[PDB]
Design an enzyme around this catalytic site. Structure first.
Site, PDB file in Angstrom:
ATOM      1  CG  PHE A 149      35.353  47.803  45.185  1.00 16.32           C
ATOM      2  CD1 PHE A 149      35.247  48.188  46.519  1.00 16.32           C
ATOM      3  CD2 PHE A 149      34.197  47.641  44.450  1.00 16.32           C
ATOM      4  CE1 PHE A 149      34.009  48.395  47.103  1.00 16.32           C
ATOM      5  CE2 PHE A 149      32.946  47.842  45.039  1.00 16.32           C
ATOM      6  CZ  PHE A 149      32.858  48.220  46.366  1.00 16.32           C
TER       7      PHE A 149
ATOM      8  CG  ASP B 229      42.001  51.548  49.012  1.00 13.73           C
ATOM      9  OD1 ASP B 229      41.984  51.276  50.239  1.00 13.73           O
ATOM     10  OD2 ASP B 229      40.965  51.668  48.330  1.00 13.73           O
TER      11      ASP B 229
ATOM     12  CE  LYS C 250      36.543  47.275  53.592  1.00 10.25           C
ATOM     13  NZ  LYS C 250      36.327  46.188  52.611  1.00 10.25           N
TER      14      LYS C 250
HETATM   15  C1  Y3D Z   1      40.085  48.369  49.087  1.00 14.72           C
HETATM   16  C2  Y3D Z   1      38.779  49.064  49.466  1.00 14.72           C
HETATM   17  N1  Y3D Z   1      38.738  50.390  49.516  1.00 14.72           N
HETATM   18  C3  Y3D Z   1      37.619  51.028  49.862  1.00 14.72           C
HETATM   19  C4  Y3D Z   1      36.470  50.309  50.158  1.00 14.72           C
HETATM   20  C5  Y3D Z   1      35.177  51.035  50.525  1.00 14.72           C
HETATM   21  O1  Y3D Z   1      34.980  51.075  51.911  1.00 14.72           O
HETATM   22  P1  Y3D Z   1      33.432  51.335  52.411  1.00 14.72           P
HETATM   23  O2  Y3D Z   1      32.869  52.675  51.677  1.00 14.72           O
HETATM   24  O3  Y3D Z   1      32.586  50.175  52.079  1.00 14.72           O
HETATM   25  O4  Y3D Z   1      33.394  51.418  53.875  1.00 14.72           O
HETATM   26  C6  Y3D Z   1      36.492  48.929  50.106  1.00 14.72           C
HETATM   27  C7  Y3D Z   1      35.397  48.236  50.385  1.00 14.72           C
HETATM   28  N2  Y3D Z   1      35.360  46.832  49.996  1.00 14.72           N
HETATM   29  C8  Y3D Z   1      34.300  46.154  50.030  1.00 14.72           C
HETATM   30  C9  Y3D Z   1      33.010  46.562  50.700  1.00 14.72           C
HETATM   31  C10 Y3D Z   1      31.874  45.765  50.089  1.00 14.72           C
HETATM   32  C11 Y3D Z   1      30.492  46.360  49.843  1.00 14.72           C
HETATM   33  O5  Y3D Z   1      30.399  47.509  49.334  1.00 14.72           O
HETATM   34  O6  Y3D Z   1      29.464  45.705  50.141  1.00 14.72           O
HETATM   35  C12 Y3D Z   1      32.493  44.655  49.223  1.00 14.72           C
HETATM   36  C13 Y3D Z   1      33.980  45.017  49.071  1.00 14.72           C
HETATM   37  O7  Y3D Z   1      34.750  44.506  48.329  1.00 14.72           O
HETATM   38  C14 Y3D Z   1      37.663  48.286  49.752  1.00 14.72           C
HETATM   39  O8  Y3D Z   1      37.739  46.888  49.676  1.00 14.72           O
END
Ligand code: Y3D
Ligand code: Y3D
Lengths: 402, 402
Positions: B140, B226, B255
C-alpha cells in the site's frame, strides 16, 4: 546567511527539479515579500494563486493557531469535529451536494479521474476498462505518472516510463474538436481549465465554456473543471466558469483554498457522481484533517468578506489596459481575466522572459516566466489600486529599460 | 454538537469514501484523544504513525506558530530561506546526499517511481518505455491511479479504469521470487515496505531485507524502501531497515515527518539517482514550503531528543509479550516491531475485529481494524510504561469480555 548561501545550500542538499528565480525570500505579508537582505518586492505570482488572500493573512493565521492547540490529525479511521463543518460550508458555498477533501491539486485531479472512471463503468455502463478521459493540449494538473500521461509538454513526460492509457488529448478552445472526440461512447469525462495557467494564461474564446457544457451534457460526459488556479476570486468570480454561467459536473479547488497556509484541495460534485466511490475505495492520510479544514474555512471567509473577486475584476481591467499601452515592438500580447494575466514579449537572443524577470526582480517586482516569452502578472487579490499602479510603473520601467 | 450530529453531518455533505469507527474526536494531546462528549481515549493508531511524537507536541506546535507569522509559501518559482536548512538537516540525518520534498506519502511514492524510470532509461540504458518496477503483494502506498495499479487489494483498483503498465507484482517476504523477477533486465526498481502496514503489520522473516539489498545490487536494480509508516522510530530504529543494517537506494519518508501538523513527505537518495530529474521535470506547489520545513525540522528533533526509538523498542517488547499472554482460542496471532504491532483474532460470525474495536472504544482505547480479523496496536512513541500497561489491561478486559 545571505541569498547566495541559500542558493548554494539548496544546490548541495536538495534535488535539482527546479531552477527558481535567484531571489531568497524569508518574510511575506499581504502583497509583499522580503528577501534575506531585507529587500522588498511586489509578489506578482501569488504562489500560483495560493495566496490570493495575500501572504500570512491574519485571520487564516489565527484559525491555524487556534486549531493547532486542539487537534491536527486523527486520520479518517475516526471522525474529527471540524471536517463536517467545513464540508457543509464549502458545499453550500458552491452549491454542490458533496465534497471529497484531499491535500494537493494533483490529488484532486486524480480523485476526479477515479470518479469519472467509476461513474463511467457503474452508471454510464462503459465496459471495464474502456473508459476514456479527454484533456486539452496545454493542460497542467500536476506531476504524478497519470497527470503527465495527459501532458503535451515533453519536459513533463519524456523519460518517465510507460504512460496511463485511456487519456485522449484534443486542442484547447476548440468546440468542434470536442464534438468529434465525444462521438466515442466510451468517453467518461472531459477535464479542462477555464483558463490554462501553466500554459501561459490562455483564455479561451467567449462561449467556449458554454459549448463544452452543452456538448458534455448532450453525450452524457462529465464536465470536470479544474479551477485550482482560476477559482476562488483570482479571475474576478468565485469560479472562472461563473463568467459564462456554466455548472460543471466536477469542480476541482486548491491553492487559495488555504490561503497558502496548508495543502488543502477539494473535489466538488453531486451525489450521482460522488457516491460511486464506496467506503474503503479512496482516500488519503491527511485529507480532511481538522487543521486544514479550519484554515480552509477561514480562507474562504476572507475571500467572501473582503469582496476580493470584485476587486480582482476591477484591478484586472486596470492592469490589462495599462499593459496594453506597452509598445507592440516589445510586448506581443496581453491576456487574462481578473488578476490572472500574462504578457508575451518579442523574444530575441539579446533578450528573453528570464532576463525581463531578473530585471523586474532588480526593480522590486517578482514574476515568473513560463517558456521564454511569457511572463505572468498575478498579484494577491488584496492589492489596492495605488499599489497596483506603482507595480505597473515598475513593469513599465523594466520593459522600457531594454 | 454531539457525536451523532457529527456523523450525520459528514454523511450529508461529505463523500462516503470512508467508514470510520463511530467516535468523534475534538482534542488530542500526547497519547490521548478526547471526543465531543469529553470522553478520554488512548490512541492506539497514532494516525498511521503520523503522531509518533504524540498529538500536538508542543515543540512542533511552537515551530509552526513561529514560522506562520513569517512566511508560509512562495512556491518553488523563488527560493525561501528555510528549505535548504531542512534539506541539509534531513540529508545529514539519514546520510543520503539529497532529498526531494513533497507533501503526501503517495506523492513520495510517485516521485520514487519517476526517479526509477528516469534512472533506468538514462543511466541503466533500458529502452523507452520498457522499464518495469516490481512491488510486493499486499503493498500500500496511496490512492492515485498508479498506486492502485500496483495494488493486489481489489477494493483499491476494481472499477478505476485501465491501469499503469510497467508494474509487476511478486509475493512479499519471498527472496526466490525476487531473484526470479530480477532476471528481467528491464526491471529498474523494486519498491517494498520493510514491514507492510496496511496489509496488517506483516513482518518479513529475518534476512529478507538483507537479501533484497543483495539481489537489487547484483542485478543493478534500485531498492526503494517505503518507510512512510515504518520509519521515524515507530519500529524502534530511525528506519525499520536499520534492523538489518541495510542501505536502500531510495528511502521514502512521511507522516511522522511532521508530527501530524502538516503534510510533509521526503524522497531521499544519492546524486546518481536524484539528478536524473532535471530542472522543470518534476515538482509540486506546496513541496518544500517553509512552514512544512520548519515543522519537519522540529518533528525530527523531537524524535532524536526524546530517544523515542529506544522507547518504542522497549515498550514494544513489553506490549508483544503481554499480548501473547492472551488465549490462543481468541487471539490467533501477535506480530510487530517496536510500537507497530497487530493481533489476529479468531473471527466468527458472532464476533469480528470491528466489534472488538467498538468495545475497545467503549472501554477507552481507539484502534483500527484492517480486514475483519486484524487489529493494529500502535500508540504514540511518547507513551510511558505505566500508561502502556493500563492500555494493555484495557485490551485484556475487552478481549476477554466476549
Ligand atoms: C507505507 C505507506 N506508504 C504510503 C502511504 C500513502 O501516504 P498518503 O498519500 O496517504 O499521505 C501510506 C499511507 N497509509 C495509509 C493511509 C490511509 C488512508 O489512505 O486513509 C490508510 C493507510 O494504510 C502508507 O502506509
Ligand atoms: C490548474 C492546476 N491544477 C492542478 C495543479 C496541481 O496542484 P499541486 O499538485 O501542485 O498542488 C496545478 C498546479 N500548478 C502549478 C504548480 C507548479 C509546480 O508544480 O511547481 C507550477 C504550476 O503551474 C494547477 O495549476
Amino acid at each position: 546567511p545571505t541569498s547566495d548561501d541559500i542558493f548554494e545550500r539548496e544546490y548541495k542538499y536538495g534535488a535539482h527539479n527546479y531552477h527558481p528565480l535567484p531571489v531568497a525570500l524569508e518574510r511575506g505579508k499581504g502583497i509583499y515579500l522580503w528577501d534575506v537582505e531585507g529587500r522588498k518586492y511586489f509578489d506578482f505570482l501569488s504562489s500560483y494563486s495560493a495566496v490570493n488572500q495575500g501572504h500570512c493573512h491574519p485571520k487564516i493565521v489565527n484559525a491555524l493557531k487556534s486549531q493547532v492547540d486542539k487537534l491536527t490529525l486523527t486520520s479518517r479511521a475516526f471522525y474529527n469535529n471540524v471536517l463536517g463543518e467545513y464540508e457543509e460550508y464549502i458545499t453550500k458555498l458552491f452549491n454542490y451536494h458533496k465534497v471529497l477533501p484531499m491535500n494537493t491539486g494533483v490529488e484532486a485531479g486524480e480523485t476526479a479521474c477515479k470518479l469519472a472512471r467509476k461513474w463511467g463503468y457503474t452508471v454510464k455502463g462503459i465496459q471495464k476498462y474502456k473508459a476514456k478521459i479527454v484533456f486539452a493540449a496545454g493542460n497542467f494538473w500536476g506531476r504524478t505518472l497519470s497527470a503527465i500521461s495527459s501532458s503535451t509538454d515533453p519536459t513533463s513526460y519524456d523519460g518517465f516510463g510507460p504512460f496511463m492509457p485511456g487519456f485522449d488529448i484534443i486542442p484547447y478552445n476548440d468546440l468542434p474538436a470536442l464534438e468529434r472526440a465525444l462521438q466515442d461512447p466510451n468517453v467518461a469525462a472531459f477535464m479542462v481549465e477555464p483558463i490554462q495557467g501553466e500554459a501561459g494564461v490562455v483564455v479561451p474564446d467567449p462561449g467556449y465554456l458554454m459549448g463544452v457544457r452543452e456538448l458534455c451534457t448532450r453525450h452524457q460526459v462529465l464536465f470536470i473543471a479544474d479551477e485550482i488556479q482560476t477559482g476562488l476570486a483570482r479571475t474576478g468570480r468565485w469560479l472562472a466558469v461563473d463568467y459564462e454561467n456554466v455548472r460543471p459536473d466536477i469542480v476541482l479547488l486548491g491553492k487559495a483554498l488555504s490561503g497558502g497556509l496548508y495543502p488543502v484541495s477539494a473535489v466538488l460534485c453531486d451525489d450521482d457522481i460522488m457516491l460511486t466511490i464506496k467506503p474503503g475505495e479512496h482516500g488519503s492520510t491527511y485529507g480532511g484533517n481538522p487543521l486544514g479544514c479550519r484554515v480552509a474555512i477561514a480562507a474562504l471567509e476572507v475571500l467572501e468578506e473582503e469582496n476580493l473577486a470584485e476587486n480582482a475584476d476591477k484591478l484586472g481591467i486596470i492592469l490589462r489596459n495599462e499593459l496594453m499601452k506597452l509598445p507592440s515592438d516589445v510586448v506581443t500580447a496581453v491576456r487574462g481575466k481578473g488578476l490572472l494575466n500574462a504578457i508575451v514579449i518579442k523574444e530575441t537572443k539579446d533578450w528573453d522572459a528570464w532576463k525581463v524577470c531578473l530585471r523586474l526582480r532588480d526593480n522590486g517586482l517578482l514574476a515568473k516566466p513560463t517558456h521564454g516569452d511569457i511572463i505572468r502578472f498575478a498579484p494577491p487579490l488584496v492589492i489596492k489600486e495605488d499599489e497596483l499602479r506603482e507595480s505597473i510603473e515598475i513593469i513599465n520601467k523594466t520593459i522600457l529599460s531594454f
